[PDB]
Amino acid sequence: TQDSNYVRTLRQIELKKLEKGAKQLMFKSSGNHTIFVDSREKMNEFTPEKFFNTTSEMVNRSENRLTKDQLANASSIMPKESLDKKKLKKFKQVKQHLQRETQLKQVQQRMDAQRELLKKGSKKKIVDSSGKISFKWKKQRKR
Amino acid sequence: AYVLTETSAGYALLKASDKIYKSSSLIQDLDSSDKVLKEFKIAAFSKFNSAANALEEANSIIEGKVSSQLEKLLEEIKKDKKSTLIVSETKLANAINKLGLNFNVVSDAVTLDIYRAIKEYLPELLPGMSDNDLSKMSLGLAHSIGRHKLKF
């Protein structure tokens, strides 16, 4: 019993750290953005650059399509590598938190099944095809 | 004829040079601006007094039926045995139809564009009654009535 309390405590810590990491950090969107244009000729004559009145780079960019009129790094040191290395490493830190949490979950699954084998009842040890065993209790009311 | 609209201040009646044909012509002449404002500024206003409970009861019992400020409104309105009045609610319409002026009232016709125009130009009809920013006591009414509807 003390063992499974320990494991569950660790898992809950990690679960909350995962939540806070995702809260802190932004992920890029990816969704279909379909325009409704009436006439077939102007539909054929569509260009994003005029429509969102921007430059093709800023067109494919989809978190800020700041216009040409809106348009009309030296702060962060070495932004080509240091900034991007930091970006990726924040992502990896959230991912690593996630794997820690799933593993602790499984360890608690195994431990919880054992504790309940210990309790009571009239069990039956059934064996699956794959090699995995399982237990199935007799149909009885605990009193 | 006449039109009735309710505010966060009080009830307003406006004279109209005749109706439904006024609805047609008004949306046809694109008539929610200063031109229609000066066409029909005001005929009459009747406040409810600025006592917070008296507001909340006037407003709740206008959500249900007809209030006493509406009563004093209805004796002050009439000039003819027959009078026909637009109301944007069928409930309030049939209530005042069965109520005591004995004059015909009409329900939700195509006079939604009329009340849209009035309800736009209406704070510029506050020159007619009281040209002050009513948006405060609008918020105050919203807060007051929500706190009414909730038990609290």
């Binding site: 950090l25 890029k28 969107s29 969102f52 800020n64 | 909730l150």
Partner: protein, 228 residues
């Protein structure tokens, strides 16, 4: 320590630094309503959650013409807990106002307290199907944003935009296709709904899918033309 960047939609800023965030200003500092963080650079700023607001993933999903402009007046339908409403009051500021309605009671109480905290809000806590008991209050709004999960989105939005929305008004609707149908393609449900609105006199500009933030959800934006 942090760089700000303006956004195409005015009133929307992005903090670029060691970590990127989507952020607005604030009107009443020294507070945080829903446990969200903030950043203060000097002036306060407050971030959203596109995992918690629909409108956020509307924005940062890349959205060309949203019509909520800083000075304006914005109706909000289906404001549970008002977190997105707080964001709406931040993005309008004092010269614009927001008209947030909710049906039930517990998001209503939270709405009421947050409306106590903020100026820009008037809350309507009456039912959303019937627009009369607050045509008494609401005044001739500019834009309408609505998320209701009740399947009568066409009807509620038709009635509310008829009664309140300015001509050439802006309307932005959310949809959960899994609430509407839950049999067929979510795309098909979306096309069915844009046909509803196009019958109901709203000209539809844009459709957008919030694929990596919610499941099966759509945002549809359009103009409102020549009605009463």
């Amino acid at each position: 320590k942090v760089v700000i960047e303006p956004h195409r939609h005015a009133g929307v800023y992005i903090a670029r630094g060691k970590e990127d965030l989507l952020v607005t200003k604030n009107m009443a500092p020294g507070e945080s309503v829903y446990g969200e963080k903030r950043i203060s650079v000097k002036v306060e700023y407050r971030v959203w959650n596109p995992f918690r607001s629909k409108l956020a993933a509307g924005i940062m999903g890349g959205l060309d013409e949203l019509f909520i402009a800083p000075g304006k007046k914005v109706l909000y339908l289906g404001a549970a807990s008002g977190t997105s409403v707080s964001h709406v009051s931040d993005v309008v500021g004092p010269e614009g106002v927001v008209y947030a309605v909710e049906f039930s009671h517990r998001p209503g109480r939270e709405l009421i307290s947050m409306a106590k905290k903020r100026p820009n809000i008037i809350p309507i806590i009456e039912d959303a199907r019937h627009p009369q008991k607050y045509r008494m209050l609401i005044g001739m709004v500019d834009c309408v944003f609505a998320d209701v999960a009740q399947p009568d989105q066409a009807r509620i939005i038709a009635l509310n935009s008829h009664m309140f929305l300015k001509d050439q008004g802006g309307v932005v609707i959310s949809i959960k296709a899994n609430c509407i149908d839950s049999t067929v393609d979510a795309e098909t449900v979306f096309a069915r709904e844009v046909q509803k609105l196009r019958e109901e006199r709203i000209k539809p500009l844009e459709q957008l899918t919030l694929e990596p933030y919610e499941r099966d959800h759509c945002i549809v934006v359009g103009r409102y033309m020549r009605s009463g």
